[PDB]
Design a protein around this ligand. Structure first.
Ligand SMILES: [Zn+2]
Ligand SMILES: [Zn+2]
Lengths: 537, 533
């Protein structure tokens, strides 16, 4: 059951340590001082997320810290890396004695509750109370009279969020960048109002050298319903050259939406008008932004009301992606692919596809009407929504990448590298774990490719793309996933993930030859540490 | 201006490390097993209290766990000992860089709020709702509609309290001590219902080898109002024989109340009926029960309704008292007192006075009516209540000790040792610091003694009791403090604390000569850690 110090050191070493140094010599003094305050606010996301993941985390940490044995130090490292006593890579197997199984409910729901109890209470509420109860930024608690009630995040986490708000406000007073001041002010305010709409708009309107993402966003930690958002931060320095090169993609979105291989009625004829894309070098992440496998890029807001009315912002973490490529993808390709396809794995393809993935998160069905009630694909699919959506983004990303190479917007060299790089990366992602949204979604795609003849298994164990079947296979899964989403068909989604969201034995064979290769990275944010020491008061 | 590693290590060393070992060999197996589960629940009060004291604590703790230089390690130890970045012995001076001055409000009140703002909001509520807002077991937060609201503790700390409730319910199933089962079950329920009355009664009715005190109790950490309770635990093993020696005191309570040296109308004509007294050897403490200076004993509940209707329970932590007396009081007595008076220091006098102190917390004014409004002494005096109530308990404890010696209930030997032992302890408590309730209250007493000539300073700078002036001095201060509480006179309380709650030059000179003596103790709960593995 429980690993010894060497077994645990080894498990933790699957996250290759990387010192994440980011050049900040180009920033004026004032912007470094603002950045230090921002960093200080960001740090607060770490204990916030820790206690979202599990209410017993703070208590355990105090136990872990007293044990300065070598085993104890490995346990503390593992705990901090995984934000809890469960191995995120190994289907949440505990590595600390005396802990229970990882609760799907995290610390978002009533003490003692079951999923069934929560659902039954929600369904007894009037419409408006249901939407409040099932929203991103409320917890659910048992009140003194024993009945369930909704608590706004601004109230749940007030102490911590007040301190974060104060630091963002101090940052806002130091920066000379107007769009950053505005974001910082409005996000400080949102923390305490619980209304994120204005501050998300300000966030999308950012055009500054410092690109802070901070607040409650992703729902992967709510394993019951995928309703409740987790606190996170990513704080980066804008890479202007790379950002400018991508601006042209925003203009391609409405056309892609207009041509989605689904029933025409299901298409969005008017996407939100904001589609900023920013390339940044990240110099800090926290909360849900620093646990297990590192985030490479993202598309926010997730909140469909803001996204429908305004659009969404895609962020690429270039330096993180270069580390993943270098330290994981290239070594994987050497084992997973036949010798002749290894030259067709390129960072340009990897990067580009990640971009297409974030672009396509913002396209396809989101707000939908199911059985006479207006809802959202996410709300309809509940705990199945995350895996399905990641699959959709990945597969429709390829669909869109092909379209944009065809029209000349993307380089023709991507015709040679796009699918083979994706195939190597399928092995990369599936090693995140079959219960992890990206991992599960990639297993479903890869199985789809095998079942349609778009990838094949060779006799040396390696896998390879079969080009003449790839494009139609990509298009079919795009159609399947989006149509299931549009229907709000939770039962179909569950069945598909149960049947196809698995590691087939040919894939497991490759995974056994990759035990010597890291699964992802462990950032040490050396520049962020020094900024806060040098500029922080 | 912050301390370096060796300086901070020396600071922390003023809490003398004590291995706290408790003999559990006479507990049956099932009771040891329930004790473990109880100890698991108790551990939860540590992070609960950390978060109550400062919203910045969990974030700071993660920074400190990562600095493993020798400075880092001393910073972590001091952080855990003081339950925050502020030195509880040095007027809350920070010992961590980048930390603000300790917030009086802790993490009980709304983000960005001032004390004046909370006062105005409360005053603006319907009388019905003011009680909820100024009660022990709600936090106050700004809601999204902009306005302040009340959050029950059972909602505010839900996750952690659910885990604590689960563990107490597990303990209840293991133990075969019926009354312990009842307490553990009702307390588990209380954590989630936020109504502690029934479980307090069950806690007072306990008759078991294991004495678990666990829940939200003392208000010292609310430096604005003294409204809000902090989570704590004290887990111990009953000393049967010592407990039986004290059973007789319960019967003395109403009689003591009946004779308090105040306007007779102010006396309570009928105390709550319950007055259990327990002597226990503590084997674990947490939350507000393990920060800085250790608690020696206590009187709970603080909830004046339960107390008035049902009574209160007094618990003496004998092993902790023994360590304080040996390691601290005794060495102080050899400096602070003239050589002739030193033989009149005794553990019996020290122990006895602490008991009187705990008895007298439960007597005197509590529920009072101030300007047409039913209230409590505590809520009327706000941030001044704690130091006034501690001075009351100490000085009225001497008044009661003297009365019980005069009656024959306590032995005459205490006539020789009670005042002189208390004088040495006064130097003990004032070293906790002038901003700490016990220390400020003891300053107020020692200075009253100086002013009435009940204690004098000798030419060699030592202090000594003047016996023929002491009894009357104790009585007038008892009268002063109780009358002040009865009137709910917060202005007078503030004025008395500011004027008399200070370390005078003669005392400071003694304190200088005490630089080598520990201030208190740091428990290492060796038996508790064994039970939980
Ligand atoms: Zn995605
Ligand atoms: Zn007291």
């Amino acid at each position: 059951r429980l690993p010894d110090a060497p077994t645990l050191k080894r498990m933790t070493a699957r996250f290759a340590p990387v010192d994440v140094k980011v050049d900040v010599s180009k920033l004026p003094d004032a912007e470094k001082r603002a950045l230090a305050k921002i960093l200080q606010a960001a740090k607060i996301m770490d204990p916030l997320f820790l206690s979202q993941a599990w209410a017993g985390n703070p208590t355990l940490l105090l136990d872990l810290v007293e044990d300065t044995t070598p085993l104890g130090k490995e346990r503390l490292h593992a705990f901090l890396l995984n934000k809890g006593p469960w191995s995120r890579l190994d289907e949440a197997k505990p590595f600390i004695p005396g802990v229970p199984p990882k609760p799907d409910e995290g610390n978002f729901y009533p003490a003692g509750a079951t999923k069934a109890e929560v659902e039954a209470w929600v369904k007894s509420l009037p419409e408006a109370q249901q939407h409040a109860a099932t929203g991103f930024f409320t917890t659910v608690r048992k009140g003194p009279d024993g009945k369930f009630l909704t608590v706004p995040y601004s109230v749940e986490y007030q102490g911590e969020l007040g301190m974060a708000a104060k630091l963002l406000r101090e940052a806002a007073a130091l920066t000379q960048q107007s769009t950053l001041k505005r974001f910082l002010e409005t996000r400080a305010e949102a923390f305490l109002s619980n209304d994120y709409y204005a501050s998300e708009v300000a966030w999308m309107e950012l055009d500054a050298s410092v690109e802070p993402t901070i607040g409650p966003y992703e729902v992967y930690e709510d394993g019951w319903f995928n309703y409740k958002a987790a606190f996170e931060a990513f704080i980066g320095v804008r890479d202007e050259a790379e950002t400018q090169k991508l601006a042209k993609f925003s203009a391609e979105l409405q056309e892609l939406e207009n041509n989605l291989p689904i029933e025409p009625a299901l298409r969005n004829p008017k996407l939100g008008a904001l589609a900023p894309i920013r390339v940044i070098n990240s110099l800090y992440s926290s909360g849900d932004g620093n646990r297990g496998v590192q985030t490479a890029a993202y598309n926010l807001p997730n909140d469909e009301r803001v996204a429908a009315e305004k659009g969404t912002k895609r962020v690429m973490l270039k330096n993180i992606q270069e580390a993943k490529f270098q330290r994981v993808l290239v070594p994987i390709a050497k084992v997973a692919l036949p010798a002749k396809d290894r030259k067709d794995v390129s960072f340009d393809a990897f990067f580009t596809h990640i971009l297409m993935h974030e672009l396509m998160h913002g396209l396809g069905p989101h707000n939908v009407t199911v059985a006479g009630k207006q809802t959202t694909v996410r709300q309809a699919l509940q705990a199945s929504s995350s895996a399905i959506e990641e699959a959709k983004a990945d597969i429709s990303g390829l669909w869109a990448l092909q379209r944009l190479v065809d029209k000349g917007t993307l380089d023709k060299e991507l015709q040679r590298t796009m699918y083979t790089t994706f195939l190597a990366s399928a092995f990369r992602s599936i090693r995140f774990g079959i219960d992890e949204a990206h991992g599960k979604g990639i297993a479903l795609q890869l199985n789809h490719f095998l079942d349609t003849g778009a990838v094949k298994v060779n006799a040396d164990g390696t896998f390879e793309v079969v080009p003449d079947k790839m494009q139609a296979s990509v298009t079919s899964l795009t159609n399947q996933l989006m149509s299931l989403q549009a229907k709000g068909d939770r039962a179909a989604a569950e069945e598909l993930l149960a049947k196809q969201g698995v590691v087939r034995p040919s894939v497991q064979k490759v995974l056994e030859k990759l035990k010597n290769v890291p699964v992802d990275i462990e950032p040490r944010y050396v520049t962020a540490e020094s900024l806060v020491k040098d500029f922080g008061a």
